[PDB]
Design a binder for this molecule. Structure first.
Ligand SMILES: N[C@@H](C(=O)N1CCC[C@H]1C(=O)NCc1ccncc1)C(c1ccccc1)c1ccccc1
Ligand SMILES: *[C@@H]1O[C@H](CO)[C@@H](O)[C@H](O)[C@H]1NC(C)=O
Ligand code: NA
Ligand code: NA
Lengths: 31, 11, 251
Protein backbone atom coordinates (compact mmCIF):
# COMPACT_ATOMS: atom_id res chain seq x y z
CA UNK A 1 0.00 0.00 0.00
CA UNK A 2 1.06 3.60 -0.58
CA UNK A 3 0.39 4.12 3.13
CA UNK A 4 2.06 0.95 4.41
CA UNK A 5 4.19 1.06 7.52
CA UNK A 6 2.84 4.35 8.86
CA UNK A 7 0.96 3.84 12.13
CA UNK A 8 -2.22 5.87 12.75
CA UNK A 9 -1.38 6.39 16.43
CA UNK A 10 2.31 7.18 15.88
CA UNK A 11 3.78 8.25 12.53
CA UNK A 12 0.49 9.66 11.25
CA UNK A 13 0.30 12.05 14.21
CA UNK A 14 4.07 12.53 14.62
CA UNK A 15 4.19 10.69 17.96
CA UNK A 16 7.05 8.34 18.78
CA UNK A 17 6.71 5.11 20.69
CA UNK A 18 8.82 4.53 23.78
CA UNK A 19 11.60 2.46 22.17
CA UNK A 20 11.78 3.24 18.43
CA UNK A 21 14.70 5.59 19.14
CA UNK A 22 16.72 2.53 20.20
CA UNK A 23 16.29 1.16 16.70
CA UNK A 24 17.32 4.43 15.06
CA UNK A 25 20.43 4.70 17.22
CA UNK A 26 21.56 1.29 15.95
CA UNK A 27 21.27 2.30 12.27
CA UNK A 28 24.65 3.67 11.15
CA UNK A 29 24.14 3.43 7.35
CA UNK A 30 23.67 6.76 5.64
CA UNK A 31 23.74 9.29 8.48
CA UNK B 1 -8.60 -19.36 28.87
CA UNK B 2 -9.89 -17.44 25.85
CA UNK B 3 -13.06 -15.36 25.95
CA UNK B 4 -15.77 -16.64 23.63
CA UNK B 5 -15.88 -14.83 20.31
CA UNK B 6 -19.19 -13.95 18.60
CA UNK B 7 -20.93 -16.95 17.06
CA UNK B 8 -20.96 -15.37 13.59
CA UNK B 9 -17.22 -15.96 13.25
CA UNK B 10 -17.48 -19.67 13.96
CA UNK B 11 -20.26 -20.19 11.41
CA UNK C 1 8.34 -13.12 24.04
CA UNK C 2 10.97 -13.54 26.81
CA UNK C 3 12.32 -10.44 28.58
CA UNK C 4 10.19 -8.03 26.55
CA UNK C 5 7.59 -5.50 27.62
CA UNK C 6 3.93 -4.68 27.09
CA UNK C 7 3.24 -3.12 23.72
CA UNK C 8 1.76 0.34 23.53
CA UNK C 9 -1.73 0.69 22.07
CA UNK C 10 -1.48 0.77 18.28
CA UNK C 11 2.27 0.10 18.35
CA UNK C 12 2.07 -2.87 15.96
CA UNK C 13 -1.16 -2.43 14.00
CA UNK C 14 -0.06 -5.06 11.50
CA UNK C 15 0.02 -7.71 14.24
CA UNK C 16 -2.18 -10.70 13.50
CA UNK C 17 -3.21 -13.58 15.77
CA UNK C 18 -3.81 -16.92 14.13
CA UNK C 19 -6.57 -18.47 16.22
CA UNK C 20 -7.57 -22.12 16.28
CA UNK C 21 -11.33 -22.61 16.20
CA UNK C 22 -11.49 -25.90 18.15
CA UNK C 23 -9.99 -25.97 20.75
CA UNK C 24 -10.05 -22.17 20.92
CA UNK C 25 -6.37 -21.29 21.32
CA UNK C 26 -3.52 -19.19 20.00
CA UNK C 27 -1.87 -20.91 17.04
CA UNK C 28 0.74 -18.39 15.94
CA UNK C 29 1.50 -14.81 15.06
CA UNK C 30 1.26 -13.35 11.58
CA UNK C 31 1.24 -9.92 9.95
CA UNK C 32 -1.06 -7.84 7.76
CA UNK C 33 0.51 -6.82 4.45
CA UNK C 34 -2.63 -5.55 2.66
CA UNK C 35 -6.36 -5.50 3.22
CA UNK C 36 -6.67 -9.11 1.95
CA UNK C 37 -3.27 -10.75 2.65
CA UNK C 38 -1.64 -12.06 5.84
CA UNK C 39 1.95 -13.30 6.11
CA UNK C 40 3.09 -16.02 8.52
CA UNK C 41 5.55 -18.88 8.98
CA UNK C 42 4.84 -22.05 7.03
CA UNK C 43 5.47 -24.19 10.11
CA UNK C 44 2.49 -22.50 11.78
CA UNK C 45 0.27 -24.24 9.22
CA UNK C 46 2.25 -27.32 8.11
CA UNK C 47 4.68 -29.35 10.22
CA UNK C 48 4.27 -33.11 9.71
CA UNK C 49 6.69 -34.13 12.50
CA UNK C 50 4.06 -32.78 14.93
CA UNK C 51 1.04 -33.92 12.86
CA UNK C 52 0.28 -30.27 12.04
CA UNK C 53 -1.53 -29.68 8.73
CA UNK C 54 -4.19 -27.00 9.04
CA UNK C 55 -6.81 -26.27 6.40
CA UNK C 56 -8.53 -22.93 5.87
CA UNK C 57 -11.63 -23.72 7.94
CA UNK C 58 -9.60 -24.76 11.00
CA UNK C 59 -8.45 -21.20 11.69
CA UNK C 60 -9.43 -17.59 12.10
CA UNK C 61 -7.26 -14.49 11.92
CA UNK C 62 -7.78 -11.83 14.57
CA UNK C 63 -6.53 -8.37 13.65
CA UNK C 64 -6.16 -5.24 15.75
CA UNK C 65 -5.63 -7.07 19.02
CA UNK C 66 -3.78 -6.11 22.18
CA UNK C 67 -5.14 -8.37 24.91
CA UNK C 68 -4.19 -12.02 24.37
CA UNK C 69 -7.37 -13.69 25.60
CA UNK C 70 -10.11 -11.01 25.61
CA UNK C 71 -12.60 -10.50 22.81
CA UNK C 72 -11.73 -6.84 22.09
CA UNK C 73 -15.16 -5.64 21.10
CA UNK C 74 -15.25 -2.66 18.69
CA UNK C 75 -11.48 -2.89 18.19
CA UNK C 76 -10.39 -6.24 16.84
CA UNK C 77 -11.70 -7.70 13.61
CA UNK C 78 -11.98 -11.42 12.96
CA UNK C 79 -11.50 -12.70 9.41
CA UNK C 80 -12.00 -16.06 7.72
CA UNK C 81 -9.45 -17.62 5.37
CA UNK C 82 -10.12 -18.02 1.66
CA UNK C 83 -6.89 -19.84 0.81
CA UNK C 84 -3.52 -20.83 2.29
CA UNK C 85 -0.35 -20.70 0.15
CA UNK C 86 2.78 -22.37 1.52
CA UNK C 87 6.12 -21.85 -0.18
CA UNK C 88 6.58 -24.83 -2.56
CA UNK C 89 10.14 -25.38 -1.33
CA UNK C 90 9.47 -24.99 2.40
CA UNK C 91 11.81 -27.53 4.03
CA UNK C 92 9.93 -28.94 7.02
CA UNK C 93 12.00 -32.13 6.84
CA UNK C 94 15.36 -30.61 7.83
CA UNK C 95 15.88 -26.98 8.85
CA UNK C 96 12.70 -24.93 8.13
CA UNK C 97 14.32 -23.38 5.06
CA UNK C 98 11.85 -20.99 3.35
CA UNK C 99 9.56 -20.91 6.40
CA UNK C 100 6.93 -18.66 4.83
CA UNK C 101 3.23 -18.82 3.98
CA UNK C 102 0.50 -16.46 2.81
CA UNK C 103 -3.20 -16.41 3.69
CA UNK C 104 -5.82 -14.65 1.59
CA UNK C 105 -8.81 -13.43 3.57
CA UNK C 106 -12.38 -14.00 2.43
CA UNK C 107 -13.17 -10.28 2.74
CA UNK C 108 -11.02 -7.15 3.05
CA UNK C 109 -10.39 -5.96 6.58
CA UNK C 110 -11.19 -2.36 7.38
CA UNK C 111 -8.20 -0.28 8.44
CA UNK C 112 -8.44 1.65 11.70
CA UNK C 113 -6.24 3.16 14.40
CA UNK C 114 -5.47 -0.44 15.44
CA UNK C 115 -5.34 -2.18 12.03
CA UNK C 116 -2.85 -1.11 9.35
CA UNK C 117 -0.46 -2.98 7.02
CA UNK C 118 3.33 -3.16 7.29
CA UNK C 119 5.57 -2.62 4.28
CA UNK C 120 7.63 -5.30 2.62
CA UNK C 121 11.27 -4.41 1.89
CA UNK C 122 12.80 -3.56 -1.45
CA UNK C 123 16.34 -4.75 -2.25
CA UNK C 124 17.89 -1.44 -1.21
CA UNK C 125 16.09 -1.17 2.11
CA UNK C 126 17.08 -4.76 2.88
CA UNK C 127 20.71 -4.18 1.95
CA UNK C 128 20.83 -1.01 4.05
CA UNK C 129 19.16 -2.33 7.20
CA UNK C 130 19.99 -6.06 7.36
CA UNK C 131 23.36 -5.54 8.99
CA UNK C 132 24.90 -6.95 12.13
CA UNK C 133 24.21 -4.69 15.10
CA UNK C 134 21.15 -3.06 13.54
CA UNK C 135 18.10 -3.67 15.71
CA UNK C 136 14.65 -4.85 14.77
CA UNK C 137 11.49 -5.39 16.78
CA UNK C 138 9.68 -8.67 17.45
CA UNK C 139 6.12 -8.86 18.78
CA UNK C 140 3.88 -11.69 19.92
CA UNK C 141 1.60 -13.33 22.48
CA UNK C 142 3.87 -16.35 22.97
CA UNK C 143 5.35 -17.69 26.18
CA UNK C 144 7.16 -15.37 28.56
CA UNK C 145 9.63 -18.10 29.57
CA UNK C 146 11.00 -21.21 27.94
CA UNK C 147 9.79 -23.56 30.69
CA UNK C 148 3.72 -18.12 31.80
CA UNK C 149 1.58 -16.39 29.17
CA UNK C 150 1.10 -12.64 28.73
CA UNK C 151 -1.98 -10.56 29.35
CA UNK C 152 -1.21 -8.31 26.37
CA UNK C 153 0.99 -8.23 23.28
CA UNK C 154 4.73 -8.25 24.07
CA UNK C 155 7.52 -6.36 22.31
CA UNK C 156 11.30 -6.72 22.27
CA UNK C 157 14.01 -4.98 20.25
CA UNK C 158 16.94 -7.20 19.21
CA UNK C 159 20.14 -6.73 17.18
CA UNK C 160 20.86 -8.71 14.02
CA UNK C 161 23.87 -10.99 14.55
CA UNK C 162 26.89 -11.64 12.32
CA UNK C 163 26.31 -14.70 10.14
CA UNK C 164 29.37 -16.62 11.41
CA UNK C 165 28.19 -16.16 14.98
CA UNK C 166 24.72 -17.40 14.03
CA UNK C 167 26.25 -20.45 12.37
CA UNK C 168 28.62 -21.21 15.27
CA UNK C 169 25.73 -21.14 17.76
CA UNK C 170 23.82 -24.07 16.32
CA UNK C 171 24.01 -27.50 14.74
CA UNK C 172 21.11 -26.73 12.38
CA UNK C 173 22.15 -25.96 8.80
CA UNK C 174 21.61 -22.24 8.23
CA UNK C 175 20.71 -20.88 4.80
CA UNK C 176 20.64 -17.52 3.09
CA UNK C 177 16.85 -17.54 3.61
CA UNK C 178 17.43 -17.06 7.36
CA UNK C 179 19.04 -14.52 9.63
CA UNK C 180 19.49 -14.53 13.39
CA UNK C 181 19.09 -11.89 16.07
CA UNK C 182 19.60 -11.48 19.79
CA UNK C 183 22.11 -10.26 22.32
CA UNK C 184 25.33 -12.05 23.12
CA UNK C 185 26.06 -13.29 26.65
CA UNK C 186 28.52 -10.44 27.24
CA UNK C 187 26.14 -7.69 26.15
CA UNK C 188 24.09 -7.47 29.37
CA UNK C 189 20.69 -7.17 27.69
CA UNK C 190 18.55 -10.16 26.69
CA UNK C 191 15.29 -11.10 24.99
CA UNK C 192 13.95 -13.58 22.47
CA UNK C 193 10.92 -14.96 20.76
CA UNK C 194 9.43 -18.14 22.17
CA UNK C 195 6.80 -20.76 21.38
CA UNK C 196 3.58 -19.05 20.31
CA UNK C 197 5.47 -16.13 18.73
CA UNK C 198 6.08 -18.14 15.53
CA UNK C 199 4.94 -16.45 12.40
CA UNK C 200 5.02 -12.94 13.84
CA UNK C 201 7.02 -10.10 12.36
CA UNK C 202 10.56 -8.82 12.85
CA UNK C 203 10.22 -5.17 11.79
CA UNK C 204 12.64 -2.27 11.28
CA UNK C 205 11.83 1.43 10.90
CA UNK C 206 13.60 2.83 7.86
CA UNK C 207 15.54 6.00 8.76
CA UNK C 208 15.25 7.11 5.12
CA UNK C 209 11.46 7.28 4.83
CA UNK C 210 10.27 6.62 8.43
CA UNK C 211 8.16 3.60 7.47
CA UNK C 212 8.09 0.20 9.15
CA UNK C 213 9.29 -2.74 7.07
CA UNK C 214 8.92 -6.41 7.86
CA UNK C 215 12.36 -7.95 7.40
CA UNK C 216 11.79 -11.27 9.13
CA UNK C 217 9.29 -13.86 10.33
CA UNK C 218 9.76 -15.63 13.67
CA UNK C 219 10.87 -19.10 12.60
CA UNK C 220 12.99 -21.18 14.98
CA UNK C 221 15.33 -21.32 17.92
CA UNK C 222 16.86 -23.68 20.44
CA UNK C 223 14.96 -22.89 23.60
CA UNK C 224 14.06 -19.28 24.42
CA UNK C 225 16.50 -16.58 25.56
CA UNK C 226 19.34 -19.01 26.19
CA UNK C 227 22.81 -17.55 26.55
CA UNK C 228 24.79 -18.20 23.40
CA UNK C 229 21.71 -19.07 21.35
CA UNK C 230 19.93 -16.77 18.93
CA UNK C 231 16.52 -16.55 17.36
CA UNK C 232 16.24 -17.34 13.64
CA UNK C 233 13.96 -15.47 11.28
CA UNK C 234 12.80 -16.07 7.73
CA UNK C 235 14.51 -13.57 5.39
CA UNK C 236 11.44 -11.86 3.90
CA UNK C 237 13.26 -9.99 1.14
CA UNK C 238 14.98 -13.18 -0.13
CA UNK C 239 11.52 -14.74 -0.61
CA UNK C 240 9.73 -11.63 -1.91
CA UNK C 241 9.63 -12.83 -5.53
CA UNK C 242 7.49 -15.75 -4.36
CA UNK C 243 5.26 -13.41 -2.33
CA UNK C 244 4.71 -11.19 -5.35
CA UNK C 245 4.07 -14.17 -7.64
CA UNK C 246 1.31 -15.45 -5.33
CA UNK C 247 -0.35 -12.08 -4.88
CA UNK C 248 -0.14 -11.26 -8.61
CA UNK C 249 -1.62 -14.63 -9.59
CA UNK C 250 -4.30 -14.90 -6.89
CA UNK C 251 -5.01 -11.36 -5.65
N1 LIG D 1 13.56 -25.95 18.55
C1 LIG D 1 13.27 -26.23 17.16
C2 LIG D 1 12.31 -25.21 16.54
O1 LIG D 1 12.53 -24.01 16.70
N2 LIG D 1 11.21 -25.65 15.90
C3 LIG D 1 10.74 -27.03 15.70
C4 LIG D 1 9.74 -26.88 14.57
C5 LIG D 1 9.14 -25.50 14.77
C6 LIG D 1 10.27 -24.65 15.37
C7 LIG D 1 9.76 -23.76 16.51
O2 LIG D 1 9.40 -24.26 17.58
N3 LIG D 1 9.69 -22.45 16.25
C8 LIG D 1 9.18 -21.49 17.22
C9 LIG D 1 10.27 -20.89 18.06
C10 LIG D 1 10.91 -21.64 19.02
C11 LIG D 1 11.87 -21.05 19.82
N4 LIG D 1 12.23 -19.76 19.71
C12 LIG D 1 11.61 -19.05 18.76
C13 LIG D 1 10.64 -19.56 17.93
C14 LIG D 1 14.57 -26.20 16.31
C15 LIG D 1 14.39 -26.65 14.87
C16 LIG D 1 14.80 -25.84 13.83
C17 LIG D 1 14.63 -26.23 12.51
C18 LIG D 1 14.05 -27.46 12.22
C19 LIG D 1 13.65 -28.28 13.25
C20 LIG D 1 13.82 -27.89 14.57
C21 LIG D 1 15.72 -26.93 16.98
C22 LIG D 1 16.99 -26.38 17.01
C23 LIG D 1 18.06 -27.09 17.54
C24 LIG D 1 17.87 -28.36 18.03
C25 LIG D 1 16.60 -28.91 18.02
C26 LIG D 1 15.53 -28.20 17.50
C1 LIG E 1 -1.58 -31.62 4.22
O1 LIG E 1 -3.01 -31.73 4.17
C2 LIG E 1 -3.53 -31.59 2.84
C3 LIG E 1 -5.03 -31.55 2.96
O2 LIG E 1 -5.59 -32.83 2.73
C4 LIG E 1 -3.03 -32.76 2.00
O3 LIG E 1 -3.53 -32.62 0.67
C5 LIG E 1 -1.51 -32.79 1.99
O4 LIG E 1 -1.05 -33.97 1.34
C6 LIG E 1 -0.95 -32.76 3.42
N1 LIG E 1 0.50 -32.65 3.39
C7 LIG E 1 1.30 -33.27 4.26
C8 LIG E 1 2.77 -33.05 4.07
O5 LIG E 1 0.85 -33.97 5.17
NA1 NA F 1 27.33 -24.74 13.41
NA1 NA G 1 20.26 -15.89 23.50
Amino acid sequence: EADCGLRPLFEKKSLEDKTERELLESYIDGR
Amino acid sequence: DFEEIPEEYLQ
Amino acid sequence: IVEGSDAEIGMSPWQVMLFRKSPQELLCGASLISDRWVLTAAHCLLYPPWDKNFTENDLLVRIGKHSRTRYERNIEKISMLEKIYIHPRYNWRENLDRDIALMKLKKPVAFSDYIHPVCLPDRETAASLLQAGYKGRVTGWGNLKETGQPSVLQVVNLPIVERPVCKDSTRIRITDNMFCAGYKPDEGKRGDACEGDSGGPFVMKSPFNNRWYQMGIVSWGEGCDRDGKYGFYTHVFRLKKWIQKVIDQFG
